Each structure stands twice: as C-alpha cells, then as structure tokens.
Design an enzyme around this catalytic site. Structure first.
Site, PDB file in Angstrom:
ATOM      1  N   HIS A 142       0.878  -1.134   0.000  1.00  0.00           N
ATOM      2  CA  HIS A 142       0.000   0.000   0.000  1.00  0.00           C
ATOM      3  C   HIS A 142       0.965   1.247   0.000  1.00  0.00           C
ATOM      4  O   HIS A 142       0.873   2.142  -0.856  1.00  0.00           O
ATOM      5  CB  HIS A 142      -0.930  -0.036   1.201  1.00  0.00           C
ATOM      6  CG  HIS A 142      -1.725   1.220   1.429  1.00  0.00           C
ATOM      7  ND1 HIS A 142      -3.085   1.287   1.245  1.00  0.00           N
ATOM      8  CD2 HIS A 142      -1.326   2.477   1.782  1.00  0.00           C
ATOM      9  CE1 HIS A 142      -3.490   2.526   1.477  1.00  0.00           C
ATOM     10  NE2 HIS A 142      -2.448   3.254   1.842  1.00  0.00           N
ATOM     11  N   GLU A 143       1.903   1.270   0.927  1.00  0.00           N
ATOM     12  CA  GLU A 143       2.773   2.440   1.077  1.00  0.00           C
ATOM     13  C   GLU A 143       3.700   2.679  -0.153  1.00  0.00           C
ATOM     14  O   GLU A 143       3.769   3.813  -0.652  1.00  0.00           O
ATOM     15  CB  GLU A 143       3.590   2.415   2.372  1.00  0.00           C
ATOM     16  CG  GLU A 143       2.793   2.183   3.676  1.00  0.00           C
ATOM     17  CD  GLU A 143       1.769   3.162   3.997  1.00  0.00           C
ATOM     18  OE1 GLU A 143       1.679   4.177   3.254  1.00  0.00           O
ATOM     19  OE2 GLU A 143       1.044   2.913   5.021  1.00  0.00           O
ATOM     20  N   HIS A 146       1.965   4.264  -3.084  1.00  0.00           N
ATOM     21  CA  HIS A 146       1.880   5.730  -3.036  1.00  0.00           C
ATOM     22  C   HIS A 146       3.011   6.386  -3.833  1.00  0.00           C
ATOM     23  O   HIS A 146       2.792   7.385  -4.536  1.00  0.00           O
ATOM     24  CB  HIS A 146       1.874   6.265  -1.612  1.00  0.00           C
ATOM     25  CG  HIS A 146       0.541   6.176  -0.966  1.00  0.00           C
ATOM     26  ND1 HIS A 146      -0.580   6.691  -1.545  1.00  0.00           N
ATOM     27  CD2 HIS A 146       0.158   5.673   0.235  1.00  0.00           C
ATOM     28  CE1 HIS A 146      -1.623   6.484  -0.742  1.00  0.00           C
ATOM     29  NE2 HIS A 146      -1.195   5.847   0.328  1.00  0.00           N
ATOM     30  N   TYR A 157      -3.946  14.422  -2.902  1.00  0.00           N
ATOM     31  CA  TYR A 157      -4.354  13.746  -1.665  1.00  0.00           C
ATOM     32  C   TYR A 157      -5.484  14.460  -0.928  1.00  0.00           C
ATOM     33  O   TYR A 157      -5.355  14.871   0.244  1.00  0.00           O
ATOM     34  CB  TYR A 157      -3.158  13.506  -0.768  1.00  0.00           C
ATOM     35  CG  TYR A 157      -3.311  12.288   0.053  1.00  0.00           C
ATOM     36  CD1 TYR A 157      -3.273  10.994  -0.536  1.00  0.00           C
ATOM     37  CD2 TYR A 157      -3.551  12.378   1.418  1.00  0.00           C
ATOM     38  CE1 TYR A 157      -3.433   9.859   0.230  1.00  0.00           C
ATOM     39  CE2 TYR A 157      -3.741  11.180   2.233  1.00  0.00           C
ATOM     40  CZ  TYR A 157      -3.654   9.953   1.636  1.00  0.00           C
ATOM     41  OH  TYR A 157      -3.809   8.810   2.420  1.00  0.00           O
ATOM     42  N   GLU A 166      -5.822   6.536  -2.553  1.00  0.00           N
ATOM     43  CA  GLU A 166      -5.990   5.487  -1.505  1.00  0.00           C
ATOM     44  C   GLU A 166      -6.392   4.143  -2.010  1.00  0.00           C
ATOM     45  O   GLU A 166      -5.808   3.113  -1.606  1.00  0.00           O
ATOM     46  CB  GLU A 166      -6.944   5.931  -0.408  1.00  0.00           C
ATOM     47  CG  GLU A 166      -6.256   6.709   0.732  1.00  0.00           C
ATOM     48  CD  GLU A 166      -5.109   5.896   1.363  1.00  0.00           C
ATOM     49  OE1 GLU A 166      -5.298   4.742   1.847  1.00  0.00           O
ATOM     50  OE2 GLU A 166      -3.993   6.429   1.337  1.00  0.00           O
ATOM     51  N   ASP A 226      -9.949  13.627   7.541  1.00  0.00           N
ATOM     52  CA  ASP A 226      -9.235  12.659   6.735  1.00  0.00           C
ATOM     53  C   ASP A 226      -9.010  13.177   5.291  1.00  0.00           C
ATOM     54  O   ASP A 226      -9.181  12.471   4.343  1.00  0.00           O
ATOM     55  CB  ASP A 226      -9.949  11.292   6.851  1.00  0.00           C
ATOM     56  CG  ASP A 226      -9.250  10.184   6.076  1.00  0.00           C
ATOM     57  OD1 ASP A 226      -7.958  10.111   5.989  1.00  0.00           O
ATOM     58  OD2 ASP A 226     -10.027   9.364   5.501  1.00  0.00           O
ATOM     59  N   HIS A 231      -9.583   7.938   3.109  1.00  0.00           N
ATOM     60  CA  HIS A 231      -9.504   6.528   3.562  1.00  0.00           C
ATOM     61  C   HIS A 231     -10.894   5.982   3.769  1.00  0.00           C
ATOM     62  O   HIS A 231     -11.052   4.818   4.163  1.00  0.00           O
ATOM     63  CB  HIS A 231      -8.724   6.389   4.904  1.00  0.00           C
ATOM     64  CG  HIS A 231      -7.266   6.734   4.812  1.00  0.00           C
ATOM     65  ND1 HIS A 231      -6.778   7.995   5.171  1.00  0.00           N
ATOM     66  CD2 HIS A 231      -6.180   5.969   4.523  1.00  0.00           C
ATOM     67  CE1 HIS A 231      -5.461   7.994   5.035  1.00  0.00           C
ATOM     68  NE2 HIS A 231      -5.073   6.765   4.687  1.00  0.00           N
TER      69      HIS A 231
END
Ligand code: CA
Ligand code: CA
Ligand code: CA
Ligand code: CL
Ligand code: CL
Ligand code: CL
Ligand code: CL
Ligand code: CL
Ligand code: CL
Ligand code: CL
Ligand code: CL
Ligand code: ZN
Length: 316
Positions: A142-143, A146, A157, A166, A226, A231
């Site tokens: 996931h990271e 990005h 974002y 996301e 958020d 998310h």
C-alpha cells in the site's frame, strides 16, 4: 554502502523465517543490491528523524525481536518490487530503478505507516491496536504504491482524487498480497491490526461498510476530516475493484468477475496512461473503461464488467 552482496536469514513480525539480501562491509547491512539501484532498510531507533541509520548487523542473522520489523520491511519491499517488475514491467516506483528506502522503529507506540514523499516509514504499533506495521505485506505494498502513484497519475491527496489515490494503494497492496500468496484476502492490514482480536482489519474491499466505509457513491463523505475522507470514500472504488475482479450483485446490479490479473492490468494502465492529479471518480470510470478497451476491445466482457462495477457503486 559499497560492499559485497550477501544473504542473511531472519524472522519477520509474524514469526516466519525468510532470506534477506544484505550487503557486507564490516557489518552486514539491510541493503539488497539485487533489485534496481537497491533496497535499503533503516533503523529510526524510536525517534522521528528520517531515515535514521542504515540497518547494520554483526552476523547476518536477524532473529532478535527488534529485528523483525526491519526484516519484513526489507523483504516485502522486495516482493513488491518483484510484483511491479514481473507483472507490469515496471522497474521500481519511478520506472527507472529508484532506490527503495524504508525506516522501522519510527517513534514510540506509533500506530501507523506512511510514504513521506521519499521513503516508507513504519511504526511498531502500541501493541494493542497494532503490532509492527511492516508485518503486513498489504501495508508495505500500500505504502510503496503511493510512490508509484506520485510518479505516475500524481493524484492529489484530498477529496475524490485522494480517495482514488488510496484505493489504488489498497488495490495494489492486495494484488501484491495475492502475488506473494500467503493466506491473501480482500481485507487491509489484518496481519498487523488488533493482535488480540481475530478476523478484523482496518478496511474491507469486499464489504467496505463492515468498517463503516461507503460502498456506494450516494454514501460519499463530504466533510473535511481525513483530507475529505480519502480513507473512507476509497470504499467506493475498492468495492468497484473487488466487483471487477470477483464479480457479484451489489444493490441489484450484477457484475461478471474477470479475475485479479485483468483487474491489475486494467488499473495499472489507467494509473499510468489515463489518470491525472485532479481525476475524480467519474474520470476514473472513463480511464478504466479506456484501459479495458485498449487491452481487450470495445465489445469485450472486460469492458462490460468495468462498466457494471462502476454502475453498481453509483459512479457514472
Ligand atoms: Ca544478528
Ligand atoms: Ca490483506
Ligand atoms: Ca486483529
Ligand atoms: Cl514473518
Ligand atoms: Cl496512508
Ligand atoms: Cl511472502
Ligand atoms: Cl461500523
Ligand atoms: Cl483527520
Ligand atoms: Cl479466488
Ligand atoms: Cl487472475
Ligand atoms: Cl462508461
Ligand atoms: Zn494510503
């Protein structure tokens, strides 16, 4: 560091043994020379200065508890690098073999992980909400995704573009998890979330509403928390992706699944050829329709399923 390429052995956060590619020059470092310009894993040492120290070890064996999160950050970065190269012919995050750097032991009791614009960073968790977050291949991927998004679509974002950003990270996190193929699922973070509670996770792609995320455009969040719910509203797109791969009927709309590989090809193509920094959901749907048209033809099942999946989640 300049040195010779070695192979250490260690145990990850979930107690499994694996080999890690290391570099020897006095100490053995968590520097994998076998992938692009290198994968480098650092010790932040319970602080917040980044990247902290290139991880050094006297004997090339990594079985201390302290070692485990470094082992998994390093190893799973490698697996994610392999996914992008073997599956999508992409060489690291920038497509030119950029070095992939990760730091572990970031801060004290830090219940999160992130890409900071330059590298991956992993908390240890407080031990109740989370154990060390590099423990999750879906989390690592996931990271790193990005980073891929940064260099490609560049999705802002915030709001819809941010929820796309996301979803792409959850999508590819999950497809990496399936590629590594150790009890893979359509959930996010299960391996590292709430060690005392079985079967939960941070988010669900197959049923976002299980954790209170929307599964239909009508339910989109439009407040400011958020970053406008990046998310939260990712639920809408994750559910679309799940539908495209697995199929299903969702609020009466039936979708014929086309499988993970085709999901991955279609969203990879969309990410790299059609999405822009300001793309909204409606623009995602068109990008995903064009990618599928490109790959399988205007009248294909694959295009029809992309359209069904977007109809099902209320995105026209
Ligand atoms: Ca050691
Ligand atoms: Ca998962
Ligand atoms: Ca749990
Ligand atoms: Cl493990
Ligand atoms: Cl994130
Ligand atoms: Cl694995
Ligand atoms: Cl809930
Ligand atoms: Cl917030
Ligand atoms: Cl399956
Ligand atoms: Cl497949
Ligand atoms: Cl359409
Ligand atoms: Zn993310």
């Amino acid at each position: 560091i300049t040195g010779t390429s070695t192979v250490g052995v260690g145990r990850g956060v979930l107690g499994d043994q694996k080999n890690i590619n290391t570099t020897y020059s006095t100490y053995y470092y968590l520097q994998d020379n076998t992938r692009g310009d290198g994968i480098f894993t650092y010790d932040a040492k319970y602080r917040t200065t980044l990247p902290g120290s290139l991880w050094a070890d006297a004997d090339n064996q990594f079985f201390a508890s302290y070692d485990a999160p470094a082992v998994d950050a390093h190893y799973y970065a490698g697996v994610t690098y392999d996914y992008y190269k073997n599956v999508h012919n992409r060489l690291s995050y920038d497509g030119n073999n950029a070095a992939i750097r990760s730091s572990v032991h970031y801060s004290q009791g830090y219940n999160n992980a992130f890409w900071n614009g330059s590298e991956m960073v992993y908390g240890d968790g407080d031990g109740q909400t989370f154990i060390p977050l590099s423990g999750g291949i879906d989390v690592v991927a996931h990271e790193l995704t990005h980073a891929v998004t940064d260099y490609t679509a560049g999705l802002i974002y915030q709001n819809e573009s941010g929820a796309i950003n996301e979803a792409i990270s959850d999508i590819f996190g999950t497809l990496v998890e399936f590629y590594a193929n150790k009890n893979p699922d359509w959930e996010i973070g299960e391996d590292v979330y709430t060690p005392g509670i079985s079967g939960d996770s941070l988010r669900s792609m197959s049923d976002p509403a299980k954790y209170g995320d929307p599964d239909h455009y009508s339910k989109r969040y439009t407040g400011t928390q958020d970053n406008g719910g990046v998310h939260i509203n990712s639920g809408i797109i994750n559910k679309a992706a799940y539908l495209i791969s697995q199929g299903g009927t969702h609020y009466g709309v039936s979708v014929v699944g086309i499988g993970r590989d085709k999901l991955g090809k279609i969203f990879y193509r969309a990410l790299t050829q059609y999405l822009t920094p300001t793309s909204n959901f409606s623009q995602l749907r068109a990008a995903a329709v064009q990618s599928a048209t490109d790959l399988y033809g205007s009248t294909s099942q694959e295009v029809a399923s992309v359209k069904q999946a977007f109809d099902a989640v209320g995105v026209k």
